[PDB]
Amino acid sequence: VLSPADKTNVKAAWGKVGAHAGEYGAEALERMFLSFPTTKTYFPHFDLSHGSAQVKGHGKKVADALTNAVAHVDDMPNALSALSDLHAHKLRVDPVNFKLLSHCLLVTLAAHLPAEFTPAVHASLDKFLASVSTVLTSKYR
Amino acid sequence: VLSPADKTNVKAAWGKVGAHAGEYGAEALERMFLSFPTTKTYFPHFDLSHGSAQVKGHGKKVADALTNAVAHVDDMPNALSALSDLHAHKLRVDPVNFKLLSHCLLVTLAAHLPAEFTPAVHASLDKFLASVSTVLTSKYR
Amino acid sequence: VHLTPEEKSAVTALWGKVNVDEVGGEALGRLLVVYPWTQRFFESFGDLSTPDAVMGNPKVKAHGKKVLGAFSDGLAHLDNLKGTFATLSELHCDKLHVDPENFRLLGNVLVCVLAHHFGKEFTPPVQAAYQKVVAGVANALAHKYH
Amino acid sequence: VHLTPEEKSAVTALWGKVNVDEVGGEALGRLLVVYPWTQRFFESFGDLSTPDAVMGNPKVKAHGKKVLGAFSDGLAHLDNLKGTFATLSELHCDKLHVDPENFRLLGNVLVCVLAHHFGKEFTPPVQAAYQKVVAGVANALAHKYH
Ligand code: HEM
Ligand code: HEM
Ligand code: HNI
Ligand code: HNI
Secondary structure, three states: OOOHHHHHHHHHHHHOOOOOHHHHHHHHHHHHHHHOOHHHHHOOOOOOOOOOHHHHHHHHHHHHHHHHHHHOOOOOOOOOHHHHHHHHHHOOOOHHHHHHHHHHHHHHHHOOOOOOOOHHHHHHHHHHHHHHHHHHOOOOO | OOOHHHHHHHHHHHHHHHHHHHHHHHHHHHHHHHHOHHHHHHOOOOOOOOOOHHHHHHHHHHHHHHHHHHHOOOOHHHHOHHHHHHHHHHHOOOHHHHHHHHHHHHHHHHHHOHHHOOHHHHHHHHHHHHHHHHHHHOOOO | OOOOHHHHHHHHHHHOOOOOOOHHHHHHHHHHHHOHHHHHHHHHHOOOOOHHHHHHOHHHHHHHHHHHHHHHHHOOOOOOHHHHOHHHHHHHHHHOOOOOHHHHHHHHHHHHHHHHHOHHHOOHHHHHHHHHHHHHHHHHHOOOOO | OOOOHHHHHHHHHHHOOOOOOOHHHHHHHHHHHHOHHHHHHOHHHOOOOOHHHHHHOOHHHHHHHHHHHHHHHHHHOHHHHHHHOHHHHHHHHHHOOOOOHHHHHHHHHHHHHHHHHHHHHOOHHHHHHHHHHHHHHHHHHHOOOO
């Protein structure tokens, strides 16, 4: 699903984010419960109020799980398997919500990396995030 | 993405199908043209009346394309590279129209293989077509 | 929604032979196995561990009957679907939060069931009528979002 | 089709800083580029076979203008998006056969082009507000399918 060039623009953007991931995660997250509210039922305990040390340590778990993927790009199924069973069996996240987050996650990059966010990187980032989604929502039984 | 239980059930279905596939593919295309008329515009140079012999051969090209992706189940992207270009690049087919023919393939199969089309197998064929569709569409530029 | 006389005939025609005590359970049941995430809205129904479990469930089949009922009902009011489901759309939207793709998904699992109980009697032109039907319902149910 | 005062603000305040001439082409291209099959509708536009082939394509700009145009159009008429986009609706559906999902795509690429051009200015409180409008327009556009 991901061609040679696609993988290139990915790393291209992980880099110029590097260790900022941990934030952009939370930032991409807060953009979500703030843009599409339905997504809130998945986090019943949480305080989705701005700044939350919850939404901040979560975005790291996220952004790092992605790095793991940008790393294991030629094989995400098995490398993301631990995560695929939290979202498909335990959490039962509606595939829809992923399209939502891959979108928020994408608006963060666009507004923190105006030089890298290029029409073709933009694209490659979608296929990437799309491919991540497909893996975390695959296992359903 | 596709456990052994699935790949298992797929065959017990391809099986009862037998070279009845040719006939089934065409039936799907037919169902799709009838139930989803916009998808008829991807074939302007085709006679779309009932039993129109192109559709019969085309149904066989499609079914044989499936019978092949089942064989190379664990390696579909590669095996379908030919179509990937065709559909993704040449025809520019909306990934949505794939959901339609996959639905109209499933419906066909339920219409002729009662016993084999159990919930268990239904789920599997769906995930399977869902995939072939990603492939046949994930080559875009 | 917009069915032609011929079409409108085959629907109410074929419908009349549907076992209303078992089709609801099948469609609602298969929905829960083909698109597993939809199980999350039925935690309170119990066992849904395997395809057999899910299909056996008396809550699944129970509920499934209520569902087909709403469809039954819609087939009688094809010219007022948005109203027929007015409170159902509120329910599934402001109180249950079911993303709408799922209605379109249930509607198609239903079609697959008819095709199953009606072999070749479920012909392309008939399925075509239904598609117009399940789409009307799916679209009426998601109205309190529009 | 109901946004709070808070929202009404940000929306009109950042759209006033929008290069009405270039964000429209910037969007329609980012569409044909991230959602490549959307090209099949612009055959008579020539070269598109490469990100920049598209990003520089002139018709791809002349058009992205009238598009980011109707947007601004609707933005004045927030409380009757159906009216505002009636004829524009029957065109893409009744005529061109543009599957309505693609509408929620162009609106989402769009929102993305904003984040780009306005950095931290485009804040979540801003996106939310805008997210609501993009959905509006898009649902608005698809009404002749409902
Ligand atoms: C880019 C896509 C996503 C990635 C990489 C991701 C990653 C993760 C990770 C690493 C965890 C922590 C797992 C653990 O503690 O063992 C997690 C938890 C969780 N995720 Fe996601 N996720 C994604 C999308 C989503 C979406 C779309 C939702 C739905 C809104 C969601 C809902 C949840 C929930 C409810 C938890 C458990 C939270 C808690 O109890 O603290 N995730 N995710
Ligand atoms: C378009 C096809 C559908 C129809 C006609 C339909 C109809 C109904 C009806 C008539 C009820 C009972 C309402 C009441 O008790 O007052 C109901 C309840 C419910 N439905 Fe649906 N539904 C449909 C699709 C779905 C889908 C796709 C889901 C999610 C996967 C869903 C989830 C639920 C849930 C969780 C309840 C809870 C009822 C309760 O225990 O309070 N429905 N539905
Ligand atoms: C409506 C859009 C559309 C969809 C959803 C679709 C979905 C699929 C699927 C998914 C299950 C499969 C396995 C498949 C397989 C095939 N298609 Ni599709 N095709 C579609 C539109 C076409 C068109 C158009 C052609 C060329 C037809 C012609 O001969 O003009 C085609 C040709 C083919 C061929 C012929 C290849 C060759 O020349 O040898 C195969 C095989 N296909 N198509
Ligand atoms: C990928 C398909 C596609 C999408 C998603 C899309 C989405 C949108 C959206 C937001 C969702 C808006 C506000 C919009 C607005 C417009 N489009 Ni779109 N258009 C699309 C394909 C077209 C095509 C093709 C035309 C040319 C129509 C013609 O005149 O032949 C067009 C023409 C227009 C015109 C000019 C009409 C005229 O001259 O009569 C406007 C205005 N549009 N389009």
